[PDB]
Design a protein around this ligand. Structure first.
Ligand SMILES: Nc1ncnc2c1ncn2[C@@H]1O[C@H](CSCC[C@H](N)C(=O)O)[C@@H](O)[C@H]1O
Length: 279
């Protein structure tokens, strides 16, 4: 694929194979202490940084280091979900889901839109809104697992969350592909000359498929963690953001394609419950 896409793929799969071997080694030799493992991974994480910043300039490196980082989170998440106590095993899969999302997000953009593929398509979360909401679900899981370890041992539930996450993902990406270059991480106010309307595939089902996938995936994140507090909070925060965004995004869509979209509004719902769009 595009150049900025091959860098991420090699950095992601590469970092995921380095620390996978590391995690394999630490298992077959009974290396079980938490501070020792943290120090080994830290050791080799340092290694990957300078091997990458040596082989890459500022652009390709800020791309590579993020790719490999997610790879790290990936391997470490599965590692925790396999060898951590059953009080914690849930948080491992959660980590893995998160890493995959943030990576498959960039890779999707690099494919369908190699032109504008940056570190924001890697989309490390530095958006003051999400960061607070993300870390806040962690502090609830560990406080509820410390005081209520049993709550985090119901593995059929957390697997249900995994399910809704994988689905929301497939819909998300399958929508980013279906839309092609028309897709955009940001809402557009001016019309491109190659921007046409999409109504087939997943868009035949929803006016905002990706928003649907991202919506249920986000809810599934807290269904995995079995956080009784973050599940409702995430559902509401996600809902309102997609209400405003879907609203304005549809208004611009109305001045974009006029009646085609007014007909598309009469023919397909937004995809999220209780969001009408721009009527
Ligand atoms: N139905 C549609 N067909 C083609 N382009 C669309 C579209 N809806 C929004 N867009 C454009 O793509 C950008 C948002 S991408 C939004 C995708 C959609 N919410 C989903 O979940 O699948 C907006 O700037 C808009 O200009």
């Amino acid at each position: 694929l595009s150049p900025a896409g091959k860098i991420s793929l090699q950095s992601f799969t590469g970092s995921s194979l380095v620390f996978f071997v590391i995690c394999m080694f630490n298992h077959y030799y009974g290396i079980t202490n938490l501070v020792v493992n943290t120090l080994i991974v830290f050791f080799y994480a340092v290694n990957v940084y300078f091997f990458l910043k040596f082989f890459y300039n500022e652009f390709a490196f800020a791309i590579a280091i993020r790719a490999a980082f997610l790879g790290l989170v990936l391997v470490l998440g599965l590692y925790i979900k396999l060898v951590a106590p059953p009080n914690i095993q849930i948080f491992g899969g959660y980590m893995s889901v998160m890493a995959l999302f943030h990576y498959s997000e960039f890779l999707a953009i690099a494919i369908v839109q190699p032109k504008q593929v940056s570190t924001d398509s890697f989309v490390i979360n530095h958006s003051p809104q999400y960061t607070i909401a993300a870390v806040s679900s962690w502090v609830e899981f560990f406080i509820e697992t410390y005081f209520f370890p049993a709550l985090k041992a119901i593995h059929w539930l957390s697997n249900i969350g995994l399910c809704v996450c994988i689905l929301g993902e497939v819909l998300r990406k399958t929508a980013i592909l279906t839309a092609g270059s028309n897709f955009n991480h940001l809402v557009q106010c001016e019309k491109s000359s190659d921007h046409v309307l999409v109504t087939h595939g997943v868009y035949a089902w929803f006016r905002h498929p990706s928003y649907v996938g991202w919506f249920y995936w986000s809810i599934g994140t807290q269904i995995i963690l079995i956080n009784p507090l973050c599940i409702p909070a995430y559902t509401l925060a996600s809902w309102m953001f997609f209400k405003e965004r879907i609203y304005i995004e549809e208004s611009m869509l109305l001045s974009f394609f006029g009646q085609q979209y007014c007909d598309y509004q009469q023919q397909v719902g937004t995809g999220i419950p209780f969001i009408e769009g721009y009527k």
